[PDB]
């Protein structure tokens, strides 16, 4: 990556445009449950998980790792940090909305 890898013990992860990672179905199902979908009983909602699992970050945000190796997300614009991907809250609300729609 860049010549420095960490700033103040925090590793800042940078993704290239041509970088490619295809997650596993097991990971998609786990993310589905974490945003509130039952994958077995609610296949009609699973498109939200298949989109959300690889949701891009806004440019203000990077994935980071602390001195223990734990992943978090950092907003360089305002200095806020969070364990979740900043879009996960919105995917959880979309799941609720879409479950209602199909009912």
């Amino acid at each position: 990556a860049g010549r420095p890898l960490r700033i103040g013990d925090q590793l800042v992860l940078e993704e290239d445009y041509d970088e490619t990672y295809i997650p596993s179905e097991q990971e998609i199902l786990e993310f589905a449950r974490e945003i509130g979908i039952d994958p077995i009983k609610e296949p009609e909602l699973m498109w939200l998980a298949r989109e959300g699992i690889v949701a891009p970050l806004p440019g203000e945000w990077k994935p980071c790792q602390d001195i223990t190796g734990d992943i978090y997300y950092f907003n360089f614009a305002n200095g806020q940090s969070m364990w979740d991907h900043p879009c996960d809250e919105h995917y959880r609300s979309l799941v609720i909305q879409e479950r209602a729609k199909l009912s």
């Epitope: 990556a1 490619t20 997650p23 690889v54 891009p56 994935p63």
Partner: nanobody
Framework: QVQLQESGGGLVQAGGSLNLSCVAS???????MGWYRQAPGKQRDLVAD???????NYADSVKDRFTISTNNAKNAVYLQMNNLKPEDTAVYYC????????????WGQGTQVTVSS
């Protein structure tokens, strides 16, 4: 899926060397890799980072003694450890991260290192 598998630990005399290794599936190509260690009474702590293009970073306590490296496919991480000291005793862990918007972080199972005398 990634299934990180570590090796190379055990008991060693002070002043000796080890070469820890961690290997993943061939279809893995990691953005970032690193070794960590959890010493008695201490939480898990960085040892060394390496990026996909080979740049490294070390904890100050090991920089002049350890060498982290990866392979050409970026799915294996190695830690050469020279001039081992009793304070290097810890459970070592390898970490590997892929990124696709979200970060996907994987860990090996833990590698006991005990330096005696």
């Amino acid at each position: 899926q990634v299934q990180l598998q570590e090796s190379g630990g055990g008991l060693v005399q002070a002043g000796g060397s080890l070469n820890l290794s961690c290997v993943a599936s061939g279809s893995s190509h990691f953005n970032s890799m690193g070794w960590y260690r959890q010493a008695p009474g201490k939480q898990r702590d960085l040892v060394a980072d390496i990026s996909n293009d080979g740049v490294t970073n070390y904890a100050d306590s090991v920089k002049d003694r350890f060498t982290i490296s990866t392979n050409n496919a970026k799915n294996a991480v190695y830690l050469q450890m020279n001039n081992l000291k009793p304070e290097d005793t810890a459970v070592y862990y390898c970490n590997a991260v892929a990124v696709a918007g979200r970060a996907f972080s994987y860990w090996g199972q833990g590698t006991q290192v005990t330096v005696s005398s």
